[PDB]
Ligand binder design. Sequence first.
Ligand SMILES: NCCOB(c1ccccc1)c1ccccc1
Ligand SMILES: NCCOB(c1ccccc1)c1ccccc1
Lengths: 641, 77
Amino acid sequence: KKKRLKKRIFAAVSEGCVEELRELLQDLQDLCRRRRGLDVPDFLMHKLTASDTGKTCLMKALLNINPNTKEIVRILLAFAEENDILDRFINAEYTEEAYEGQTALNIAIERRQGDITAVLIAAGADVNAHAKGVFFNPKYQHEGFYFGETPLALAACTNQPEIVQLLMENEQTDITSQDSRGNNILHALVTVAEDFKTQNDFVKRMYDMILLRSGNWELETMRNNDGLTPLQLAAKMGKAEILKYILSREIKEKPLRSLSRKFTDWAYGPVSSSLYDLTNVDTTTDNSVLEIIVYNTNIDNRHEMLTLEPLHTLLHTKWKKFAKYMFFLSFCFYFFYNITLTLVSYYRPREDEDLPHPLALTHKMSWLQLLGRMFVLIWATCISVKEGIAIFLLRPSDLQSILSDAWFHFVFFVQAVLVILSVFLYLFAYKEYLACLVLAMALGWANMLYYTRGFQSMGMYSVMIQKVILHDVLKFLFVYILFLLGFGVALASLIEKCSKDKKDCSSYGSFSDAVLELFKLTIGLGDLNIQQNSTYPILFLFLLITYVILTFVLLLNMLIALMGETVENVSKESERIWRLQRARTILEFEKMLPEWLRSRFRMGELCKVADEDFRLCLRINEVKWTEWKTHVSFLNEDPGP
Amino acid sequence: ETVENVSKESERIWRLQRARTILEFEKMLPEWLRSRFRMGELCKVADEDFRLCLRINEVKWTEWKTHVSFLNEDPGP
Ligand SMILES: NCCOB(c1ccccc1)c1ccccc1
Ligand SMILES: NCCOB(c1ccccc1)c1ccccc1
C-alpha cells in the first residue's frame, strides 16, 4: 500500500515530537486533497488506525508518554476537529480479539493522566465504554486485571479518586451499568479489593465514595450473571475488609442515611445501642451471607469474617437460643445409640442362648430388652437417610475440603449403613455377620469426636487430634516403619541365620517374628525370651538399644515437629478451625429445623427514615466508651417498654 | 527458640538440601533435549531482535507510577 505516511506518524507520535508532526499534518492535508470521494472518514481511519490490532493514533499517543503529550493530544484532537471525524476518532476501539473495547479513554485513565482525561471527556469520549478482551482470564494471576471493563470502574479500581470525581459528575455516565459478567461497579471493587490491611486502603474509601456520590439503594440489589449481590460477592470471594464496611456502613448525614446498614437505637453518653439493617445477612432468604460464608470452602479467612459484629452475635444467638439444645439432644440420642450396640452384642447377662444374634427380634422379649434393639434400627436408618441426601448435595465440597470438614457426614453414614448391612447380612447369613457389625460399633464410639465440638476447649483439643492424625502421623509413621524395617533386617540375621541355641521349634515366620519382637518394644511389651542365643546376645542387645534410642529421637523430634509457633499457631489455628467447624453445624441445624415455628430471633422492625413503619429486620447491640461525640442519630431514649 | 530457630533453620537447611539435588539432576540430564525453560528472547534496546534469554513474572499493587517501560500490551499470542 506504500504506507510511508502511516508508520512515519506513529513513530513521531511515539516520540511525542510536535514540530515533526506538524509537517506530517500538512502533507496529509494535501493527501486528503488528492482524492475526495470518501473525503475525511474512510481515508484518515485507514491512516490513523492500524490494520490488524485496530490501535489508533490517539491510543498510540497514550501508550507512550513524554511531557509533550499534553500538547500532542490537543493536536491530534484538533486534527480530528478540523476534519470533523472526532466522534469515531475519540471512541475507536481495538478490533483485536485480546482488547475488545480498550478505548482511548480507558488507556488515558490507565496512565493516570487526570488533566488529559478531562480534555477527552470535553472532546466527547465515550465514558460508558466496555473492554471485553481476553484480559478477563480465569487463569487470573497472569495477564489478567479484571476491573469490570468500564472507564468509571477503572479509575475506581486504580486509586484515581479525582477521575471518579470527574466521571461521576458527567451526567452521561451510566453508574448503574453492568458487565459481560453482569457486574456493576460495586462488584468490580469487590473483585479487586485485597485482604491486605490498610494499603492506604483506597477501595473501602472509594466503595464509600461511589454510594455517597450517587445512587439509591437500587445498586446493591443488582445481581451479576451468577446472581450475587455485592454483599454476597464480597462473601463468596472472601474479601473480608470490604465486608467489614458493608455490614457496618454508618452514615452520619440526613439526605442519605437510608443507605446505611448500621443504625443507632439510642445514644446516652458512653453507652449506646446499635442496630443492623441485616436484610440479606441472616439465613432467611435463598443463598444468604452466612450461607455463603460458612458453607464456602474456597476462601482462606472464614474466621476473619465471622468475627464481624453482624455475623458474630447472630451466630451466638442462633447458638444460645437454638443450636445448643439441639446439639445436646442429638448428643444424648447418638450416645445412647452407641451404648445400645455395646449393651446388645457384648453384654451376655448370664449364659447367652448358644451364640445368639444381636439385632434379632425373637418371639418373646420384654419391652425393655428389645426396644433398644428397635432404637438402634430406627436411629441408624434416621442417620442413613440424612446424609444420603448429602450425597445429592455435596458434590464439590468433599474433594476441595480434602482434610478440613464434611468428613463427619461420611463417617456417620458409613457407621449407619454397616449397622443396616449387618441386618441385610442376617437375611443371607454369610460369614461376615459379626465382622460388619463391629466396625460399625468401632466407628460408633469413634464418631463421638463429632460431639467433642461444643465446649470451647474440648474441640480445640479434638482439632489437634484431627490435625496430627491427618497431617503428621503419616509423617512419623513413614520414618518409624523405616527404622523398623531397617533394623528388622539387621535383627533377622540373629534369627534363622545366627546361633539361636534352641530355636526353630516355636511357631513360624523368621523375618516376621524378628520384626514383631522388635515392634513390641514401642508398646513397652518387651520380651526377653525371644533373645536366648550364643554370645551374640552381647551384639543383640546393643543393636536393640540402638533401636530404642533411634526410636526415641524419632519420638523426641516428633514433639519438636509439632513445635514451631506452638505458642501461637498450633493453638490459635486449632481454635479458629474449631469455630468454623462449629458454625457449620449450627447452620446445618437450621436446615434440620422445620419451616413452621421459626418464631425466634431477628428483632423488631423499627423505622429507617421512610414512610413505612416496619422497614427492615434488625439486631441490637451495646457499644461503649471514649471518643465521645454529640450524637444526632435517632429516638433519644432508652429502648422502651 | 524452638518457636523460631529449631523449626526455621531445619526448614532452610532442607531447602538448600533439596536445591542441591535439583542441580545435581541437571548434571544427570543428558545434553540433548534440554528443550525446557529459559523463556523467549525478546529485545532489550538494540538492533538485534533476540538479545538475551528471559524469565517472566507477575508483580503487583500499590505505589503506582505512570509507567514508561516497554511494549504496552498484554503478553501476546
Ligand atoms: N460471643 C460470641 C459467641 O459465639 B461464637 C461461637 C462460639 C462457639 C461456637 C460457635 C460460635 C462466635 C461467633 C462468631 C465469631 C466468634 C465467636
Ligand atoms: N434425621 C437425622 C437426625 O439426626 B441427627 C444428626 C445429623 C447429622 C449428624 C449427627 C446427628 C440429630 C440431630 C439432632 C439431634 C438428634 C439427632
